[PDB]
């Protein structure tokens, strides 16, 4: 029954500049009132909680580091990554990011 198309693992860059597993979940996009924009939303698989709510900032350089990884700087000293079970799901979210930023989804980094 578990959806795999949008199933992801969320990572944050830790104090040793390695990656912390913050849990598996499912990723969607939606407009978030207080962030004034389309945002990436992850619900945790462990308990359904809101794990991630990240505005798609027009100026952020998102990187498609592999066919199933999207990586970006959320703030200073704060780096995030979404790892996708399905390349098709990664492509779906990459398209939304590229649409928000006015970029062609063929790029692998959205800002120069």
């Amino acid at each position: 029954m578990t959806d795999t198309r949008r199933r992801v693992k969320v990572y944050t860059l830790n104090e040793d500049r390695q990656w912390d597993d913050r849990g598996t979940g499912h990723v969607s996009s939606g407009y978030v009132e207080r962030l004034k924009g389309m945002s990436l939303l992850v619900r945790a698989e462990s308990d359904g909680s809101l794990l991630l709510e990240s505005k798609i900032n027009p100026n952020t350089a998102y990187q498609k580091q592999q066919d199933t990884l999207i990586v970006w700087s959320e703030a200073e000293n704060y780096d995030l990554a979404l790892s996708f079970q399905e390349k098709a799901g990664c492509d779906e979210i990459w398209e939304k990011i590229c649409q928000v930023q006015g970029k062609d989804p063929s790029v692998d980094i959205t800002q120069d």
């Binding site: 500049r17 390695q18 598996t24 580091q65 199933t68």
Partner: peptide
């Protein structure tokens, strides 16, 4: 079968930013 499901990003170097 796949070995694992979830890739992880590379650990970033200190230099260059």
């Amino acid at each position: 079968s796949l070995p694992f499901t979830f890739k992880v990003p590379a650990p970033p170097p200190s230099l260059p930013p």
